């Protein structure tokens, strides 16, 4: 009785970009309160669960979420009296109430808010930390963070073709040290940008978008920053890229370094970068429907470098299943709000895990003060998290959460980077 | 017995700039947990309580807070067994244990962390929201926010002399609408900056630092943004400035718009701007110790314009007392970590309130996911809050907290701007 | 405080063979009681955790476990006051107290008894079913059972070379129906054995060991039984074998069907049987250290047939790691008492899961009334369980437990065989 | 209120032979859960309470118990709100709901399941062990076990006429030692069967059915096993027989040792065996309706040997009353499911006790993981239990239960064999 849902309330709040998003509050009969906020970023297309916007041009430029918030009222009517411990029944009941494949009726933002809020309330009722509620007694692995430092493509005003350049402190003895290494490299990068003429204003993720001339200049700048902070590139702090190749792809051709490339040219660019630079991960190296060439890329590089599908997989079990069947990729970016329930997100992580793919638990461009993905990462032993740069607390809050989880785990805490659960 | 302190733990976490800061966790015998994080900004000097840094050049560039964190262990030995409800006795016990005027032995950051954490724990034990625990049954006033949009001086690479230009939605019917107004004007500003080809990278506070030529260009841009969003400058969205005059003051001269001014010239510049632009508030318009000229400024502008002391007062009761006695300023920026206990912060707010000064509850440039200042603002009916722009969740989290307080207050919720508790 | 261990007691009881084994009783301060019994089978050698026997020839033929039972007293001194929820800390404390790699000081049987008992107590304290306590909110998969029906080799008096022939109801819609299918085929087999004048006395696992002439005669008999019960061989009820090849291996030669074979001949026998019979799984098809030939077997059959390591892996993370690296096997038999803690068993299952191996949770030939492996199977979504025939309650009790778990899961219950989590 | 029945649930599970049987789950308002399983063996005739089978040839060969399970739903409607402590009112309410003498409407299996489950729940509510709940503060007597070792008659393929040959460790100082003595003799028997050419496959009860030529060969084999284990036949380990004479009786003649005998011949066979072999008990020595010759047998042997009615009495008060009136038998086999309620079973034990007959609490051929009969034996100070051999955990579980009861009784524990409560 004590864990029965008594109240579900939703509210329009703002995300880290000053845009409306949804929060939900779940109260149980025993007085346990769960509170969760929903992130938001730019949709990739057809398989991403629908973020419901009001499209009222007189409120927040058409980006109000009053309809999503009101839809939580119909979710409250369906869910009152069910046990908060039955996460799966809860999620299945909202999926059935919505009645659409992409959650376009209730809104993925309405549904995910209640899904996460309920989980927080159930963890609190059992007096379990959320990582332990979600993952059981082996939820002890702190992820290697993918830490944004330089942006390009459509995330900048520069001549860098690739979207994001990241550092990964793979060689750190603990998450606490991993975070310090990332932070020292970020501040050494800031000093190197300022010492040159370059802008230090930060984008959505808390990193820099200086006017650089090429991808190579980006990578050489990270290596300069790592060296300046006193770390070995590769063994201690390695590099990773989000290519977001779909952004410079037109009719079988990839436009990169000023030249149009055939798929084999794009693959050769990625191969040359890998053989020169300590790059351990490449996300969306080829476009989201170029499966035959992803096959080639995976056969060629997949042994030595992590190949992450984001747009490729859209946190979708069917798309990940096809990828597994075709030897396409070896990792998947996990975005809760791309699929819209905690349950379906756990099903997708499980499919990836038991097929030998790495799960990288991901933020969106629009984040909140919510830290669920820190707990989700540790609960599923994912071993990797992508949650932005070393500035802006919608990003730092997840690192702070992971410090708290690592301290509570005591002698049981493992760092993915030291036990072979990091990038591969 | 239930409200007795059982445990105080501290940890080194990161602030919104990726710099170390302190958090404290207070547990009571009844199982109530309070958790608080400490902000940080650039110290103003003599009367600012000492933020204790490790000065180990091999960790976080000398900005570790391990010594502060360890000092919470000595605070735990002193405070275990005391009632969490005795905020004042708690704070006085840490002040006495430190034994220095500026808290340089334990660290203001160690002491404030326990002070805020204890208050959060005591509110939770009584099952009271923190605003109501801190302020009693008339804690019902949501503040007018001072929303950063353009930065200059030492917070930019431009030819704007003044540090900060803010919008204040004084004419809004509620905090919920005030926030929407701020957000729409911020996005209309972003569009106007991008349409002119000016940089949209954000600073510490989540606002813009474009390459503008003058203070007048900054104010003209805010007026353009307000008009573009469909709001009336002054009546609906008014302006405020942090001059941080001590940044361009040397040898009794203020350097501003490319000309050296005597104090009377600086005063005339502020007077001219006020008569031309709907500016309702000016912070640090003259340097922090130029009290004779502050007198003149206050006699001249104080009846029509709020004149805020930040560096002027450093949240110090002694300095604010002298300022009240000499007719200097008519408002004070309230920074918890400039004085280092909740108690002394409440004493400073009380002195300002009963002397007819306005209290503007303030962030620091280094913030965290902590939202205490939202509750402190409502608890003291301060009527104003300065917590940054409409981006970055260390700023947005305070707006979200105030949305939550406004909703819980229901029909009792008042907006400072509608009942004469806003800027004056 | 409520989940702190207050009492750990152990007792000498009997297993399903009338041999001494260990049970432990764990009491928490909140009055929660966990009770667990330890199985036993014939040790495989080096990497199997040491089962501590008394070797007093005047008690139970030297197979007393009084020393193991007394050693639980030293475990009680170490563990009193620790939280039952900290399974991993609990297990690590006993591993450290033992101080030997193979647990030969305390006894694997002493340590495992406390490890399982503690987990049962912690599940009861949280009022969680043990499957949900151990696995989180996606613990919803009922395994395909590997049901013993005919025995040979050193488990019989016949001319069948292979140790065990099993039916697997892979095509069943639910575990409840899978069990009924198994039972109907077992009774149809019993009738066919009695009609031919073959012995119906049962062995350790509750199956038959009739005087048959060959492996082929065994498989032909299972096909006859399946057809007689009205089921389709392969699609509905498929076959599996434990070859226990190390029983007929000497000097690089395997003795099978009366002929000496080289490894390539043994592989060809397994290949021929697979192409003729609906065999989906083969356990220990080659001897435990013949890794070069396991490589060949895995390359040849591994895409179409599950190849299970029992003696191959001995539930050891190091051995399973090497097997994964060298493309040896694609499944592992999970025996809690081969490694001696719940934690290390979960680590081994996790390694197998994220490397794309199947975990088959296993009984020992000496079982008890304990049903932990039913919950362990569902908690880890292992998808397969090996717990003996359709007779003897040390076997049936696990099926009954899985009926109880399937009913409690309601609409969330999945059968491994219907969702691709069965043999592959 | 706390001990009121809130929920009664039943389930189809499998017994030790892989045949369906009933389990019931009783929940009280205070959250106490009782769970019980019902055994099954071959009916003796008209006075045995009806085991309800589905007789659906397409499920479990016609031996489903879905109808019995569904009938627990009508029992739930009648019993919800009654106190679990009112065992007798509970049992009388189900007897009245059924409305038939032999429980053929609800099914003895439905009724007994709820009867035992309720008792388990009531013991748990009072935090009393079930033996103490059922028997009061003198429930301290551990029974002498009747341990099956060799089978014949219709339970074997041999030339042994009698059904069962048992060892009874009458001379043991405690139950714990009694169990070790039984176990050592069973393993010494297994070695002696293997050393000769004889089968070691086990039947329903966990004993052996080797191809022996006569009853005398069976008894001589037990004496060989006892001697081999180092025990004195008679004083330490004595013999007992279940003749099941009804199986070789036709029209006043008993067929035994190849010859047809008159009743006086059958009696002389039993007399000769007793004068030669240390036989302390004979069960069903004459057929279930041969009262006049049972009189003679009782007058002749009843002084020196226990004469147990099983088929003779069918756990029936009326039949036991006639037996007491005629000086027929001096012991009764107590089978809960032959009469169908705990209450009527206790009434039958009471009638036997106060008439100077011994109550031997009995398993069925089809057993489960249930251990109620261990507690029933200790509660009624019956002093004897018949629960099978030294293998198969549906048998060993009762011995394990009695180890637990003996340990909890501490210095209060008595062994029936040492205090004159064993066979007589
Ligand atoms: Ca996207
Ligand atoms: Ca796309
Ligand atoms: Ca560009
Ligand atoms: Ca991406
Ligand atoms: Ca300052
Ligand atoms: Ca100063
Ligand atoms: Ca200032
Ligand atoms: Ca073995
Ligand atoms: Ca070996
Ligand atoms: Ca095996
Ligand atoms: Ca019978
Ligand atoms: Ca009969
Ligand atoms: Ca016969
Ligand atoms: Ca009998």
């Amino acid at each position: 009785y004590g864990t029965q849902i008594a109240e579900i309330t939703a509210r329009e709040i703002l995300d880290s970009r000053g845009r409306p998003t949804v929060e939900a509050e779940v109260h149980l009969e025993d007085g346990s309160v769960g509170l969760a906020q929903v992130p938001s970023g730019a949709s990739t297309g057809t398989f991403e669960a629908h973020e419901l916007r009001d499209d009222d041009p007189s409120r927040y430029g058409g980006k109000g979420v009053q309809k999503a918030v009101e839809n939580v009222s119909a979710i409250e009517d369906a869910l009152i009296g069910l046990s908060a411990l039955d996460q799966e029944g809860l999620d299945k009941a909202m999926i059935a109430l919505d009645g659409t494949p992409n959650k376009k009726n209730l809104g993925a933002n309405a549904i995910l808010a209640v899904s996460l809020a309920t989980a927080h309330a159930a963890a609190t009722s059992l007096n379990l930390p959320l990582y332990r509620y979600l993952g059981g007694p082996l939820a002890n692995v702190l992820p290697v963070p993918m830490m944004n430092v330089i942006n390009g493509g459509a995330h900048a005003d520069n001549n860098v073709d690739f979207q994001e350049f990241m550092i990964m402190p793979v060689g750190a003895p603990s998450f606490k040290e991993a975070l310090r290494w990332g932070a020292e490299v970020f501040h050494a990068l800031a000093k190197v940008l300022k010492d040159k003429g370059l802008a230090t204003g930060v984008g959505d993720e808390g990193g820099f978008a200086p006017n650089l001339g090429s991808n190579k200049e980006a990578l050489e700048l990270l290596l300069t920053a790592i060296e300046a902070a006193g770390y070995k590139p590769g063994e201690q702090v390695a590099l990773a890229m989000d290519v977001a190749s779909s952004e410079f792809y037109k009719n079988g051709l990839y436009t990169c370094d000023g030249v149009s490339h055939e798929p084999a040219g794009m693959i050769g660019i990625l191969a040359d970068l890998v053989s020169q630079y300590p790059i351990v991960s490449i996300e969306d190296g080829l476009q989201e429907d170029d499966w035959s060439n992803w096959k080639t890329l995976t056969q060629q590089l997949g042994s030595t470098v992590q190949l992450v599908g984001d747009d490729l997989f859209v946190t979708n079990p069917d798309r990940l299943q096809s990828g597994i069947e075709q030897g396409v990729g070896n990792a998947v970016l996990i975005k809760l709000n791309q699929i819209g329930t905690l349950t379906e997100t756990l099903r997708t992580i499980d499919l990836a895990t038991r097929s030998g793919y790495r799960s990288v638990i991901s933020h969106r461009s629009g984040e909140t003060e919510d830290t669920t993905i820190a707990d989700l990462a540790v609960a599923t032993r994912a071993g990797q998290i992508k949650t932005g740069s070393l500035s802006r607390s919608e990003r730092i809050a997840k690192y702070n959460r992971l410090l708290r989880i690592e301290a509570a785990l005591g002698e049981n805490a493992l760092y993915a980077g030291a036990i072979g659960l990091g990038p591969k």
Side-chain angles (χ1 to χ4, degrees), chain A residues 1-423:
Chain A
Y1 179 81
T3 70
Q4 290 184 357
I5 297 166
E7 198 177 71
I8 313 186
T9 298
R11 214 168 284 112
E12 182 179 57
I13 56 161
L14 296 182
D15 70 7
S16 57
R17 321 116 112 196
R19 304 284 194 190
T21 195
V22 181
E23 94 176 1
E25 208 168 324
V26 161
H27 296 59
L28 310 184
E29 296 293 357
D30 71 18
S32 300
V33 180
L35 187 70
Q37 301 83 27
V38 162
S40 167
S43 198
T44 183
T46 53
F47 287 106
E48 181 151 345
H50 181 67
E51 184 178 83
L52 187 59
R53 297 292 178 172
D54 295 345
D55 287 327
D56 180 358
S58 77
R59 286 192 82 256
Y60 282 112
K63 278 133 151 46
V65 292
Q66 298 184 314
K67 275 171 194 154
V69 168
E70 218 279 339
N71 286 341
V72 168
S73 203
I75 288 163
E76 183 186 38
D77 298 331
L79 263 52
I80 276 178
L82 296 172
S83 172
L85 301 182
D86 189 9
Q87 184 68 39
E88 178 167 27
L90 183 315
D91 287 333
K92 273 161 147 202
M94 297 193 277
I95 284 174
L97 185 64
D98 173 89
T100 70
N102 68 336
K103 301 174 171 63
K104 73 178 180 188
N105 176 30
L106 294 181
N109 45 347
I111 291 174
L112 179 65
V114 176
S115 188
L116 296 187
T118 303
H120 280 262
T124 298
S125 181
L126 294 186
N127 190 36
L128 291 171
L130 179 62
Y131 59 91
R132 174 58 180 276
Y133 175 68
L134 289 185
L138 257 217
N140 56 9
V141 179
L142 289 133
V144 184
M146 275 182 191
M147 301 165 142
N148 181 290
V149 277
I150 298 167
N151 296 268
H155 284 192
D157 202 51
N158 58 16
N159 260 287
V160 187
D161 296 293
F162 296 171
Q163 195 157 274
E164 170 177 30
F165 296 76
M166 287 158 286
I167 61 182
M168 300 190 69
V170 292
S174 72
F175 178 80
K176 171 154 162 153
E177 298 307 301
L179 187 62
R180 177 168 74 78
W181 292 16
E184 284 173 10
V185 171
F186 170 92
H187 296 299
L189 178 61
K191 167 165 166 52
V192 159
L193 290 176
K194 178 208 265 54
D195 283 355
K196 294 169 191 252
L198 295 168
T200 56
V202 301
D204 288 344
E205 306 87 354
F208 312 112
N211 206 309
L212 296 178
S214 67
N215 304 129
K216 290 203 181 155
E217 220 199 313
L219 290 152
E220 294 189 355
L221 233 74
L222 300 190
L223 291 177
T224 295
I226 292 163
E227 181 183 81
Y231 295 107
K232 182 173 299 202
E235 185 200 71
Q236 292 187 317
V237 187
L239 311 170
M241 300 185 291
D242 181 352
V243 171
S245 61
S246 287
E247 293 294 327
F248 53 82
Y249 179 91
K250 199 169 169 52
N251 291 132
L253 294 181
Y254 295 91
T255 303
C256 182
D257 305 316
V259 154
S260 277
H261 295 88
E262 306 288 339
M266 191 43 55
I267 289 175
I269 278 156
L270 294 180
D272 289 353
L273 290 180
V274 160
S275 69
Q276 192 178 347
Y277 299 111
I279 293 158
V280 288
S281 171
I282 306 171
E283 169 187 339
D284 283 342
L286 291 172
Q287 83 88 61
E288 63 206 84
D289 306 300
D290 200 351
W291 295 95
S292 22
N293 292 294
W294 266 101
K295 225 151 179 314
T296 308
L297 176 59
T298 304
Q299 291 162 5
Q300 203 179 309
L301 288 186
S303 270
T304 34
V305 319
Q306 175 170 272
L307 297 168
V308 185
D310 167 31
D311 295 341
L312 178 61
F313 289 141
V314 47
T315 317
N316 183 100
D318 304 331
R319 282 183 78 93
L320 182 57
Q321 191 67 85
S322 305
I324 295 163
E325 280 158 7
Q326 291 166 243
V328 157
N330 58 31
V332 51
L333 209 63
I334 301 298
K335 289 171 171 169
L336 280 154
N337 89 293
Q338 273 193 327
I339 195 138
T341 57
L342 178 51
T343 296
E344 295 170 286
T345 299
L346 287 164
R347 287 167 184 177
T348 298
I349 293 160
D350 191 81
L351 179 48
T353 303
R354 74 189 141 78
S355 313
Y357 283 48
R358 299 306 211 208
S359 288
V360 177
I361 311 308
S362 188
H363 66 168
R364 307 303 304 264
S365 281
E367 264 298 330
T368 74
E369 51 267 42
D370 193 84
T371 59
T372 302
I373 61 169
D375 292 80
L376 182 47
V378 171
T380 57
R381 306 188 105 235
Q384 291 171 259
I385 188 167
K386 196 193 195 189
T387 196
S389 201
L390 283 291
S391 79
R392 306 180 62 131
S393 291
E394 69 275 9
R395 317 302 159 174
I396 307 297
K398 280 74 163 169
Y399 305 141
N400 286 346
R401 180 66 190 155
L402 293 168
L403 286 181
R404 285 195 289 263
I405 298 184
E406 177 190 52
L409 284 169
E411 212 66 44
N412 302 337
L414 298 171
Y415 184 52
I419 66 163
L421 260 174

